[PDB]
Amino acid sequence: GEFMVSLPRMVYPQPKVLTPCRKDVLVVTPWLAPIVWEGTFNIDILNEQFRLQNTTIGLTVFAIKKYVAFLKLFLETAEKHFMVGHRVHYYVFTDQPAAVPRVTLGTGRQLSVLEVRMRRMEMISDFCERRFLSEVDYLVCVDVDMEFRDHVGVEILTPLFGTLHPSFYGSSREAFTYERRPQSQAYIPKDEGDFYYMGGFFGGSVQEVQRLTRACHQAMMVDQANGIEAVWHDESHLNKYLLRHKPTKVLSPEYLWDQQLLGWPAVLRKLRFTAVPK
Amino acid sequence: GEFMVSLPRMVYPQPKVLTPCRKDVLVVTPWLAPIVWEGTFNIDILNEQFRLQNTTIGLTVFAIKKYVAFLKLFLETAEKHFMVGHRVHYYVFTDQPAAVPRVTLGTGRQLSVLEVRMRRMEMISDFCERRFLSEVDYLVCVDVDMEFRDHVGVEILTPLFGTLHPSFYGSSREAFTYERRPQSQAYIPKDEGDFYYMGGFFGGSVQEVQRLTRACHQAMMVDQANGIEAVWHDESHLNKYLLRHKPTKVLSPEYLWDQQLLGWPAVLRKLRFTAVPK
Numbered sequence: 206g207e208f209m210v211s212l213p214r215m216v217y218p219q220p221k222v223l224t225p226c227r228k229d230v231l232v233v234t235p236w237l238a239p240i241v242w243e244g245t246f247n248i249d250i251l252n253e254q255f256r257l258q259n260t261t262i263g264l265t266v267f268a269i270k271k272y273v274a275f276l277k278l279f280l281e282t283a284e285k286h287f288m289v290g291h292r293v294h295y296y297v298f299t300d301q302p303a304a305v306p307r308v309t310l311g312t313g314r315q316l317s318v319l320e321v322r323m324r325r326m327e328m329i330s331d332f333c334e335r336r337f338l339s340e341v342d343y344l345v346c347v348d349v350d351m352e353f354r355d356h357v358g359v360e361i362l363t364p365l366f367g368t369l370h371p372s373f374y375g376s377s378r379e380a381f382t383y384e385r386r387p388q389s390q391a392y393i394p395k396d397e398g399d400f401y402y403m404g405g406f407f408g409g410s411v412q413e414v415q416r417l418t419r420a421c422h423q424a425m426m427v428d429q430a431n432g433i434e435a436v437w438h439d440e441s442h443l444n445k446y447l448l449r450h451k452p453t454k455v456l457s458p459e460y461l462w463d464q465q466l467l468g469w470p471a472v473l474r475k476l477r478f479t480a481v482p483k
Numbered sequence: 484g485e486f487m488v489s490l491p492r493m494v495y496p497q498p499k500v501l502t503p504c505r506k507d508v509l510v511v512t513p514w515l516a517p518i519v520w521e522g523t524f525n526i527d528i529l530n531e532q533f534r535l536q537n538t539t540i541g542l543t544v545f546a547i548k549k550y551v552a553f554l555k556l557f558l559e560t561a562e563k564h565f566m567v568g569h570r571v572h573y574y575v576f577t578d579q580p581a582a583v584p585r586v587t588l589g590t591g592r593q594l595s596v597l598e599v600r601m602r603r604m605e606m607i608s609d610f611c612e613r614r615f616l617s618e619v620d621y622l623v624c625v626d627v628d629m630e631f632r633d634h635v636g637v638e639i640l641t642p643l644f645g646t647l648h649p650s651f652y653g654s655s656r657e658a659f660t661y662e663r664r665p666q667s668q669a670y671i672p673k674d675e676g677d678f679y680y681m682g683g684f685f686g687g688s689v690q691e692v693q694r695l696t697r698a699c700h701q702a703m704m705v706d707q708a709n710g711i712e713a714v715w716h717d718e719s720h721l722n723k724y725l726l727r728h729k730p731t732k733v734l735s736p737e738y739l740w741d742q743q744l745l746g747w748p749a750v751l752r753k754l755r756f757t758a759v760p761k
């Protein structure tokens with residue numbers, strides 16, 4: 206939110222008011238948050254805006270036990286596709302610091318290995334609060350069993366975002382696998398819900414991510430004290446939070462896809478961040 | 484930007500990802516700002532969000548010389564349609580305080596008469612900076628020769644907005660009546676421009692409106708010192724500013740229409756704020 210200097214002169218195609226970018230999908234939520242699909246953004250304009258703020262993006266990823274095997278491909282493909290041209294700080298949380306692969310990084314990019322012993326929400330909020338506030342402007346929190354195949358850039362950045370789960374974007378809300386037991390803090394009735402957000406890709410400003418992760422951690426602790434575990438764990442709580450605190454952007458399933466499970470439907474022009482067999 | 488409490492439970496239609504709200508118009512800019520049309524927003528969700536922040540909206544209007552005649556209809560229709568349910572502070576700038584009509588206001592709404600002797604941008608920035616920062620969260624700056632016919636509410640609120648001029652929303656950029664002389668600070672080349680914004684309806688947070696009005700006032704003073712007056716005066720400068728500082732929402736021409744001049748085209752589902760004969 207600091208003073209924003211003027212954009213330079215730029216030559217690009219004029220947006221046309223009577224020509225939608227995309228007619229096949231919803232590109233704005235009913236609370237006026239953009240839903241990010243290919244064709245909705247001019248990345249040159251966005252890159253200018255975010256570079257003029259010297260934006261730094263933190264990316265958190267957990268690689269515990271056997272999941273350290275996923276780091277090499279995750280990080281090497283992140284170097285090809287994630288926020289290229291911007292300042293990036295990777296935070297790799299692991300129980301095996303020596304198993305973190307030595308990955309060559311582009312300029313302006315750094316990696317920190319954070320040793321650790323549910324945990325994700327606690328670890329993001331409780332332990333790293335002060336560090337993240339000092340070091341980055343935005344946090345992006347993702348699963349490790351993944352690879353980048355195409356551009357994932359500043360179009361995602363906003364105070365708070367979630368990602369449409371690739372298995373549920375066409376589903377009606379009654380079919381969503383929200384927690385349905387009223388005894389859980391994650392409870393959502395059958396007549397509520399905007400979207401089903403996937404636990405493996407959310408983010409926002411540091412402040413908003415710390416709010417989300419704190420709230421989810423607190424709600425998970427209440428459930429534990431009451432002897433209940435939400436059906437989809439942290440994802441159930443994330444869904445409850447984003448129902449009650451609307452995200453300021455929503456990422457389309459371009460941003461979290463499983464090609465082996467779901468193919469490559471017409472509505473996806475790009476597959477950006479995709480599941481690796483586990 | 485203060486801590487946002489949770490929304491309550493709400494029952495409303497599920498947004499459907501594979502059903503666009505509107506297929507006939509562009510509903511998001513290439514820099515991911517919503518373009519506000521009827522059908523794109525659920526006003527119940529937005530009202531909740533903004534009431535939970537106890538939002539106060541300031542509305543500035545100038546009524547100098549014969550234009551004091553427009554105040555009664557302007558204000559009486561604003562009471563019917565502008566931010567109803569929210570805190571509103573009208574700021575009426577006039578050379579004839581005694582000619583301001585006595586208009587009955589709903590609860591939580593107030594009106595201040597500010598006596599005055601180009602001026603609008605200066606008067607909004609220079610003279611009223613401290614007052615607005617203390618009194619309101621957002622400023623909305625409009626022409627007085629107008630009436631409200633339908634809802635104008637919190638869907639417009641955002642850090643910085645402009646409104647699509649009703650005569651130019653279908654025009655290509657070369658046809659826009661931007662200032663075209665390189666000697667003016669408002670100069671825009673024929674290969675630049677997103678939209679033609681109308682000078683009679685802009686706004687944003689107090690901070691962003693003070694930035695815009697300060698910059699436009701400064702640019703107008705430079706032009707005056709150089710012996711040039713932009714083709715459309717403050718509107719030319721507003722257009723230059725919004726080209727270089729992209730608005731975070733854009734209002735459709737629903738929000739500034741002239742029915743006598745332009746009728747009621749199919750693309751307009753509502754005529755919200757409309758020209759009165761002058």
Ligand SMILES: O=c1ccn([C@@H]2O[C@H](COP(=O)(O)OP(=O)(O)O[C@H]3O[C@H](CO)[C@@H](O)[C@H](O)[C@H]3O)[C@@H](O)[C@H]2O)c(=O)[nH]1
Pocket residue numbers: 266267268269270271272347348349350403404405406437438439440483
């Ligand atoms: O032994 C493990 C298990 C998990 N993880 C981490 O936790 C993530 C999530 O586990 P994963 O096995 O990838 O589960 P998924 O079924 O892909 O997870 C989905 O469902 C989970 C809820 O059950 C959410 O926590 C996830 O974010 C959501 O993407 C992994 O990517 C790792 O980052 C480890 O590091 N080691």
Ligand SMILES: O=c1ccn([C@@H]2O[C@H](COP(=O)(O)OP(=O)(O)O[C@H]3O[C@H](CO)[C@@H](O)[C@H](O)[C@H]3O)[C@@H](O)[C@H]2O)c(=O)[nH]1
Pocket residue numbers: 544545546547548549550625626627628681682683684715716717718761
């Ligand atoms: O004698 C006057 C003249 C103007 N105004 C104020 O200035 C506004 C703009 O003048 P108007 O006569 O309404 O001009 P328009 O042609 O409707 O204005 C368009 O074009 C102007 C640039 O020429 C911009 O300043 C306007 O905001 C834009 O709406 C009026 O609504 C009043 O608020 C007065 O109060 N008294």
Ligand SMILES: [Mn+2]
Pocket residue numbers: 348349350405
């Ligand atoms: Mn996973």
Ligand SMILES: [Mn+2]
Pocket residue numbers: 626627628683
């Ligand atoms: Mn006018």
